[PDB]
Every structure is written in structure tokens, then in C-alpha cells.
């Protein structure tokens, strides 16, 4: 990846925050599959993220998978040397703790 | 069931433009995220994360950033009108140019 910016991108301006009290309908989470872990199909909990490919799992599930001896990523099958190959992210955690 | 978007805002917003993530891009070292355009221009004059100050890469910062498909998916899904708005802005730009 070059990270070349296009003509539009060189000129783009912010997308301002919606600050008026608007509520979001999140009654079902069959609209938000990005908050569910691919292994256990639950709300991601203590989210671990792979450095190289940015796939997210519960700490529980990804440690187990690595401990099984299988070094591939469960989502994209790209190699992982170890647990130094993933980082925790409190951002996703805190996001999920607000929605459910 | 219903959550105030003002409660989710802080997790959906780029610290470099103060608006919502557009083409969210994450730093591999610390995992902080930004708009593509904001972090790319920033990393032209710095090799340290805007938020936590950690070194992104020894020499070539762009090596340790990634497109965050998942994060951008959430933002578009949660922030109503956001996606339609960005697409429109781009449509309006190319018609002008
Ligand atoms: Zn899991
Ligand atoms: Zn992966
Ligand atoms: Zn930005
Ligand atoms: Zn950081």
C-alpha cells in the first residue's frame, strides 16, 4: 500500500458530530455482527486484535486457538508467530460495554 | 435497546479532525485509530502516535498502519446519515472537478 491520497481526499473536511439527543435503535444485534466474536459467536469480551490483519476476538478464544498449536488467524488464516502478534483494545471493549 | 449517540460519539470520532471516522485507519503498535487522510498527512511530519505518543515505526510510519474495515463498518452502521453524506460529498466533488 502506497497511501496515496486522491484529489477528493486531499481536500476533504470533517464529518461533524451529531450532538442533538438522537437515540439509536440497537434492540437486535443482528445488524451489528462486528461486535460478535468469530470463534464463540458472542459479544466480544476483552477484545484482542491481531496486529497484522486487525481481526478481533475475545481474549479467551484467541489465546486458546493459539495454544492449540495452530498459528494461523481463525478469520483470514494468515500466520501468527505468538501472542506478541496481538494487542488488546480497550476502545472496542468500551464501545461494546455501552451498546450491548 | 435505545442508546444516545452522544454516548457513543467518543468511540467513533477522529481526534485529528474532530469528526467521525472516514476510511478508519489503525496504528498497529498501540491500536489508536484515525481517518485515512488525517493520519497519513500527520505521519508525514511525525513518527509518533497523536494520542499516546508511542513510536509508530523506526523509520517508515506507513508500514505500521492498517485500514480498519471493521471499525469503519461499525461507524457507518451506527451513525445514521453518515454514509449517505460522505458518498454525496464525493459525488459533489467529482461533478465540480
Ligand atoms: Zn469469543
Ligand atoms: Zn486475520
Ligand atoms: Zn479525521
Ligand atoms: Zn497510540
Amino acid at each position: 500500500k502506497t497511501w496515496e491520497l486522491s484529489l477528493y481526499e486531499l481536500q476533504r473536511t470533517p464529518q461533524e458530530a451529531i450532538t442533538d439527543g438522537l437515540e439509536i435503535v440497537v434492540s437486535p444485534r443482528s445488524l451489528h455482527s462486528e461486535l460478535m466474536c468469530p470463534i464463540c459467536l458472542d459479544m466480544l469480551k476483552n477484545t484482542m486484535t491481531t496486529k497484522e490483519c486487525l481481526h478481533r476476538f475475545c481474549a479467551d478464544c484467541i489465546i486458546t486457538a493459539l495454544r492449540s498449536g495452530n498459528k494461523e488467524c481463525p478469520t483470514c488464516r494468515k500466520k501468527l508467530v505468538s501472542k506478541r502478534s496481538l494487542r488488546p483494545d480497550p476502545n472496542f471493549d468500551a464501545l461494546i460495554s455501552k451498546i450491548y | 435497546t435505545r442508546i444516545k449517540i452522544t454516548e457513543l460519539n467518543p468511540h467513533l470520532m477522529c481526534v485529528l479532525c474532530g469528526g467521525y471516522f472516514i476510511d478508519a485507519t489503525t496504528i498497529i503498535e498501540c491500536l489508536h485509530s484515525f481517518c485515512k487522510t488525517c493520519i497519513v498527512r500527520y505521519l508525514e511530519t511525525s513518527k509518533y502516535c497523536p494520542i499516546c505518543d508511542v513510536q509508530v515505526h523506526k523509520t517508515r510510519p506507513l508500514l505500521n498502519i492498517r485500514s480498519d474495515k471493521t471499525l469503519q463498518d461499525i461507524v457507518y452502521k451506527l451513525v445514521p446519515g453518515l454514509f449517505k453524506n460522505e458518498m454525496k460529498r464525493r459525488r459533489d466533488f467529482y461533478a465540480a472537478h
Side-chain angles (χ1 to χ4, degrees):
Chain A
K1 200 161 186 182
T2 307
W3 306 100
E4 41 167 314
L5 296 178
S6 66
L7 284 173
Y8 167 83
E9 287 169 322
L10 288 166
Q11 167 263 5
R12 78 166 280 259
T13 56
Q15 286 282 347
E16 300 300 306
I18 307 169
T19 49
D20 201 293
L22 173 87
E23 327 98 292
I24 318 161
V25 178
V26 199
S27 208
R29 41 78 210 189
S30 292
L31 281 294
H32 310 81
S33 58
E34 302 87 57
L35 304 181
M36 314 291 292
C37 166
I39 318 287
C40 63
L41 277 81
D42 273 4
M43 276 302 154
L44 290 152
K45 51 209 169 64
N46 309 278
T47 306
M48 292 289 108
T49 311
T50 64
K51 282 197 167 199
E52 286 285 282
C53 50
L54 294 182
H55 295 134
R56 291 170 181 85
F57 314 89
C58 324
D60 168 32
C61 302
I62 193 60
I63 294 300
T64 300
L66 297 178
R67 195 46 186 83
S68 283
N70 188 63
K71 283 109 179 73
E72 52 166 67
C73 171
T75 301
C76 74
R77 227 204 315 182
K78 206 59 215 152
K79 57 80 198 148
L80 294 165
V81 68
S82 77
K83 311 153 199 194
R84 178 68 175 93
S85 299
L86 38 89
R87 252 39 166 77
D89 53 333
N91 190 62
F92 247 72
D93 274 353
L95 215 157
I96 291 163
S97 96
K98 286 186 169 191
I99 310 167
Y100 311 129
Chain B
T1 56
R2 279 179 179 169
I3 295 92
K4 294 145 191 160
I5 195 154
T6 67
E7 223 161 11
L8 304 181
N9 277 344
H11 305 95
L12 301 174
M13 299 208 297
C14 169
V15 140
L16 293 168
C17 61
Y20 291 109
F21 296 125
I22 297 300
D23 291 284
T25 302
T26 292
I27 302 177
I28 275 186
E29 297 299 308
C30 51
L31 236 44
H32 292 130
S33 293
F34 312 90
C35 309
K36 194 225 274 178
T37 63
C38 303
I39 195 54
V40 169
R41 312 199 80 157
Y42 177 87
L43 291 178
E44 284 174 10
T45 55
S46 175
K47 49 191 257 309
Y48 295 96
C49 174
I51 301 176
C52 70
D53 189 45
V54 169
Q55 195 187 78
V56 174
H57 191 273
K58 251 202 161 64
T59 48
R60 299 169 48 188
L62 302 182
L63 256 21
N64 282 347
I65 69 175
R66 297 286 180 282
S67 284
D68 208 317
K69 168 90 189 158
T70 296
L71 174 57
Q72 194 56 239
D73 277 357
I74 292 176
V75 179
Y76 281 153
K77 266 162 171 200
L78 289 176
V79 188
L82 177 58
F83 180 72
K84 295 180 172 61
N85 189 296
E86 248 314 288
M87 293 311 101
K88 188 187 197 290
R89 290 192 187 184
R90 292 172 194 201
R91 220 177 287 152
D92 296 355
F93 177 84
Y94 307 136
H97 294 72

